[PDB]
Amino acid sequence: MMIITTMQDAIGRTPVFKFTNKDYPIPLNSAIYAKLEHLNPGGSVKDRLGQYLIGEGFKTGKITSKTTIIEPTAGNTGIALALVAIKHHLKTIFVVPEKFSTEKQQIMRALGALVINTPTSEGISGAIKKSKELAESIPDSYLPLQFENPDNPAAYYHTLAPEIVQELGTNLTSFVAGIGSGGTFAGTARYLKERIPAIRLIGVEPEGSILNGGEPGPHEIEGIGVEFIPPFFENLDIDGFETISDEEGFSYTRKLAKKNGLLVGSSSGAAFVAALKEAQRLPEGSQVLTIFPDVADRYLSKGIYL
Amino acid sequence: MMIITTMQDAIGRTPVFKFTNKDYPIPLNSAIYAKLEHLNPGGSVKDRLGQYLIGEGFKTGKITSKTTIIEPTAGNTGIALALVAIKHHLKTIFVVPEKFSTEKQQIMRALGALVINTPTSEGISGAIKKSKELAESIPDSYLPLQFENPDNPAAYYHTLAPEIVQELGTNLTSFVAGIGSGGTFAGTARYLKERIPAIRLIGVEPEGSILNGGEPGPHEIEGIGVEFIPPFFENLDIDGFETISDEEGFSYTRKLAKKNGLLVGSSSGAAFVAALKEAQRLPEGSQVLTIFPDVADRYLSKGIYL
Numbered sequence: 001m002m003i004i005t006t007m008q009d010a011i012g013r014t015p016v017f018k019f020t021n022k023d024y025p026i027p028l029n030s031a032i033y034a035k036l037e038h039l040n041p042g043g044s045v046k047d048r049l050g051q052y053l054i055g056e057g058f059k060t061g062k063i064t065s066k067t068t069i070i071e072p073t074a075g076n077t078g079i080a081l082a083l084v085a086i087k088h089h090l091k092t093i094f095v096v097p098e099k100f101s102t103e104k105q106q107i108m109r110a111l112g113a114l115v116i117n118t119p120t121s122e123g124i125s126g127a128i129k130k131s132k133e134l135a136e137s138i139p140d141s142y143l144p145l146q147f148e149n150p151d152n153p154a155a156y157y158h159t160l161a162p163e164i165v166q167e168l169g170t171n172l173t174s175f176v177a178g179i180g181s182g183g184t185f186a187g188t189a190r191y192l193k194e195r196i197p198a199i200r201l202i203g204v205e206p207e208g209s210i211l212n213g214g215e216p217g218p219h220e221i222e223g224i225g226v227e228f229i230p231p232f233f234e235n236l237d238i239d240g241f242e243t244i245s246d247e248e249g250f251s252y253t254r255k256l257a258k259k260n261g262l263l264v265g266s267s268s269g270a271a272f273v274a275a276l277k278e279a280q281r282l283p284e285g286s287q288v289l290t291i292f293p294d295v296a297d298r299y300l301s302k303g304i305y306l
Numbered sequence: 307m308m309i310i311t312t313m314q315d316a317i318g319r320t321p322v323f324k325f326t327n328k329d330y331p332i333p334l335n336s337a338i339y340a341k342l343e344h345l346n347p348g349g350s351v352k353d354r355l356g357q358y359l360i361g362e363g364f365k366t367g368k369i370t371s372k373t374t375i376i377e378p379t380a381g382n383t384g385i386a387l388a389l390v391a392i393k394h395h396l397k398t399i400f401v402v403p404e405k406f407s408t409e410k411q412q413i414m415r416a417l418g419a420l421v422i423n424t425p426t427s428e429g430i431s432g433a434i435k436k437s438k439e440l441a442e443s444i445p446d447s448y449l450p451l452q453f454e455n456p457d458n459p460a461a462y463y464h465t466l467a468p469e470i471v472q473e474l475g476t477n478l479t480s481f482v483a484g485i486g487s488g489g490t491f492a493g494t495a496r497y498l499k500e501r502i503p504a505i506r507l508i509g510v511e512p513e514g515s516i517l518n519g520g521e522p523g524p525h526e527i528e529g530i531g532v533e534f535i536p537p538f539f540e541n542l543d544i545d546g547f548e549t550i551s552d553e554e555g556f557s558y559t560r561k562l563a564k565k566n567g568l569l570v571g572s573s574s575g576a577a578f579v580a581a582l583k584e585a586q587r588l589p590e591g592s593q594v595l596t597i598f599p600d601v602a603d604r605y606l607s608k609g610i611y612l
């Protein structure tokens with residue numbers, strides 16, 4: 001491999017898992033390609049976001065040696081920012097709704113971050129509000145606000161999307177990806193659409209998310225789901241959103257481990273189910289791309305694998 | 307990176323982290339290189355053992371298509387064997403003392419293994435006894451018994467050690483590694499000694515292990531420690547053993563996360579402190595190799611980072 005002097009040097013260049021009709025009920029000569037972002041050193045796709053936000057921040061002068069980074073997060077963005085902050089010894093404060101993965105919060109604190117909790121029932125919106133309060137009261141603070149910052153999708157446009165095309169070329173029928181903030185989906189989709197105008201775009205949410213108009217509500221699937229429509233979707237021709245039940249998402253999370261040796265989180269299982277439904281509706285020979293965002297190990301304290 | 311159809315394709319080719327006097331009290335022009343085996347897809351160095359045992363088993367006829375693999379394990383070897391078994395659809399049975407490592411047992415089961423528990427107070431020896439009973443009573447079984455099988459050190463001799471010399475060359479002063487069964491240390495040391503006759507060999511154990519003549523007793527560090535001499539050391543010229551207290555091992559586990567963004571187990575922290583002591587006693591310009599065996603994530607329920 002390589003000799004590294006920073007864990008930042010290990011971010012990206014992740015493999016792609018190829019699934020065919022020999023693995024799962026998929027049409028003849030069709031394939032699903034899953035970009036394995038869980039193999040990042042921070043254990044999620046958000047490692048790329050962290051690296052990009054801090055890197056660009058130093059270039060624009062939004063981040064200096066004096067800066068405290070404050071961000072609301074479900075966990076992974078916090079881990080990624082804390083990991084990347086180490087090289088420049090930046091202080092970090094993450095606002096996390098309480099019952100999101102305790103493992104992720106432990107890891108954030110292990111990396112030197114302060115973790116402040118908000119109530120689970122105010123969701124991510126409550127975390128955003130609280131993060132804004134802290135920033136006003138902390139000198140030299142910087143609030144990336146992944147939920148609205150166009151640098152969120154741009155991170156993936158510039159890092160993850162080029163890697164996909166480098167490995168897979170332009171022979172893709174569809175791109176299917178879970179939506180939380182919407183950055184991964186929107187940034188990657190923009191890049192693919194520029195090179196593959198005919199590609200189909202499917203966003204994936206759990207039951208109790210609002211993208212298909214349904215009522216908001218709790219869901220065991222963690223990492224995806226929106227409480228507000230992401231602002232990153234305006235220039236995008238999205239073909240549909242796929243709503244995945246907890247039962248189905250966890251079922252395919254368990255199958256990915258048992259059948260394929262992939263130890264991925266419930267948001268990966270959800271994305272995979274959505275990719276299987278998309279492959280099943282397309283002609284033979286279709287090539288469907290998805291992303292597996294994070295590792296299963298941060299959810300062992302919950303049901304995952306039961 | 308690559309397109310893979312089995313998670314086995316992703317075993318090995320791990321990076322090496324280089325530490326200098328910028329990071330820790332290491333003499334001028336000296337360095338510590340840590341082979342990052344925690345980044346294997348099963349989360350540990352044992353992935354190499356699993357891959358080797360199954361590969362060679364097919365080669366010698368010890369394993370065929372409807373062999374059942376049986377092994378007593380306190381976790382990582384079970385994960386590795388279960389992960390590798392998937393490709394060839396082999397069934398696996400692991401005998402694990404109840405209360406040894408829950409997270410690791412969950413992962414074993416997730417990968418398709420049957421996990422059978424023994425009493426905690428009978429320790430690993432109770433698991434070994436029970437595993438022996440199963441093997442006799444199951445036709446076409448295979449019972450590696452890693453703790454006495456010479457194929458344990460051979461795995462590292464053939465896989466890990468050549469990879470290290472390809473990346474780092476022959477300018478190594480010392481090899482410092484934790485001892486559980488002793489396979490990693492013995493296999494790697496044999497190969498390094500052949501290529502680098504002057505290399506120093508230091509085995510690492512926690513307090514309450516017996517290699518430096520201390521009294522046997524429990525230790526919170528997980529994965530390393532012996533209550534008796536491993537049978538793998540007969541033809542090794544070992545320079546010393548380093549006994550690491552739980553306080554020191556856990557302290558350096560926390561430092562690796564906080565200072566370096568490395569999320570590694572307590573046996574990595576222990577190895578690292580031993581490597582730091584070794585670097586500190588050698589001339590300027592010395593190059594010390596160590597191995598970080600596994601990921602921190604499987605120990606968050608045990609307060610690894612408190």
Ligand code: MET
Binds near residue numbers: 223
């Ligand atoms: C977009 S939320 C930020 C963190 C990541 N979504 C997680 O699940 O931890």
